[PDB]
Amino acid sequence: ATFEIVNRCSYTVWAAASKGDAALDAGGRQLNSGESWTINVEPGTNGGKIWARTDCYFDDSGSGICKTGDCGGLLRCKRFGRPPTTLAEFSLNQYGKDYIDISNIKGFNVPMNFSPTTRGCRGVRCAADIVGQCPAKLKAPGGGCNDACTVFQTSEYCCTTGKCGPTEYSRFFKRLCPDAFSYVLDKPTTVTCPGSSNYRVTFCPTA
Ligand code: NA
């Protein structure tokens, strides 16, 4: 599959693409305002995620840190990032079908649109000002809006037993971005696309 990562934000972001135990394509790159990044995800990739990182400083070896989405201090991520991170999640070629979604389960930092560049399905977007409206107890100093599980580490917010209901915090993310996951057992907002589709991820799609 071919993903195009576009940065429409007025500020620089450092994109990342990982499937948990290995990088996706180069793993990460700096994206100035308006820059696009094309990557190739091997068909069958399961559990891949694309996200943005803000306020990064990297050395010549690619080691550094970001205030949001840091993935172990590396520019080229081999691992998911530290919350809060708006997540673009995808499983490809699962019995002739791709599955895509946007998730606020690990917080929110940058507005995001996730849409296919081919035919057969629709796209999902979370472009609200979640950071501006973020409750005080979930605000992250570095920037972004943390999820309740990251903050309070309870069975209910993290849904550890397996059963959990919506909380006051998940409804906040859900009220602003209905098309994104607000908690683990949230009613799936997943989109089903034809196998081997191509996609474009746009940061700050409305600005
Ligand atoms: Na998730």
Curated annotation (Swiss-Prot):
Keyword annotations of the record: Cytoplasmic vesicle, Disulfide bond, Signal, Taste-modifying protein
InterPro entries per the UniProt record, alphabetical: Osmotin/thaumatin-like_sf, Thaumatin, Thaumatin_CS
A matching Pfam family: Thaumatin
Disulphide bonds in the chain: 9-204, 56-66, 71-77, 121-193, 126-177, 134-145, 149-158, 159-164
Location in the cell: Cytoplasmic vesicle
Gene3D superfamilies membership: Thaumatin
Principal localisation: cytoplasm
A single GO cellular-component term on record: cytoplasmic vesicle
Annotated PANTHER family: OS03G0233200 PROTEIN
Family in the record: Belongs to the thaumatin family.
Entry function: Taste-modifying protein; intensely sweet-tasting. It is 100000 times sweeter than sucrose on a molar basis.
Name of protein: Thaumatin I
